[PDB]
Amino acid sequence: MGHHHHHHSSGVDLGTENLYFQSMRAQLIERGQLIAEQLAPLAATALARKDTAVLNRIANEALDQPDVRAVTFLDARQERLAHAGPSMLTVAPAGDASHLSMSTELDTTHFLLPVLGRHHSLSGATEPDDERVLGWVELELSHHGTLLRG
Numbered sequence: 001m002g003h004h005h006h007h008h009s010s011g012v013d014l015g016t017e018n019l020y021f022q023s024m025r026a027q028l029i030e031r032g033q034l035i036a037e038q039l040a041p042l043a044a045t046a047l048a049r050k051d052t053a054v055l056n057r058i059a060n061e062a063l064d065q066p067d068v069r070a071v072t073f074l075d076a077r078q079e080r081l082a083h084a085g086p087s088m089l090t091v092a093p094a095g096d097a098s099h100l101s102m103s104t105e106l107d108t109t110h111f112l113l114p115v116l117g118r119h120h121s122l123s124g125a126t127e128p129d130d131e132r133v134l135g136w137v138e139l140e141l142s143h144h145g146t147l148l149r150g
Contacts, residue, residue, distance in 0.1 A: 002036025009033050022098065027057035043144050050125050052132040056082035056106065061098050064089070066150030067142055072117050074135035080110035081133065085140070090115070097149075 011029055012018060018026035031054045032040045043062065046054045052073045063071040063084035070085035083089045090113070091104055110116060117136055124137030142148045 002032065002040035005037035005039065007037060009037060023057055023061050023101075024098065027054055027061065030054045030057065041144070047139065050127060050131040050133075050137070052081050052125070052137060055132075055137070059084045060101060060104050063141060064092070064101060064104075065097050066094055067148055069140040070118070070138055071140065072136070072138040073133060074110060074117065074137070076129065076134040078110055078135070080108070080116070081106070083108075087118075088115070088138070 011033060012026075018029060028042055029038070031042055031046050031051070032038050035045060042054070042058050046058065052075075055073060059071050059073065059082040062068075068085050070088055072083045072088045073081040075081065084092070086092055086094065089104065091102065091108075093100055118138050120136070120138075122136065124139055125131060125133050125135070128134050
């Protein structure tokens with residue numbers, strides 16, 4: 001629901017605008033200020049268009065919450081972009097919203113880990129690298145739009 005606005009902004013114009021409000025401001029601006037200005041949804045549009053670039057950040061902040069079932073993201077290169085929920089994220093102690101996020105940045109590559117994805121053949125990003133990722137993405141959670149917490 002991005003609508004009309006002033007426009008002409010894209011993202012951060014100083015390198016530390018998001019840092020005042022955590023990765024939550026980074027991901028809200030990264031999608032909402034690409035679509036319009038500070039009004040379009042963070043996850044609903046990003047999942048519909050399959051933009052794993054921002055789906056990583058919103059997963060490690062919002063799919064990391066105790067209401068969530070399961071999520072994962074990987075490209076053709078055998079690189080995990082993200083992972084969240086109890087069976088995907090090995091570093092999920094749960095119990096908090098975002099404050100549990102101790103060390104689960106993009107540096108958490110797929111590598112030689114003991115688990116990956118949901119061991120499925122193909123689901124989520126059936127589209128090629130022209131969307132964002134060709135490998136796969138899992139999606140299992142509440143219908144979004146806020147007001148839904150464990």
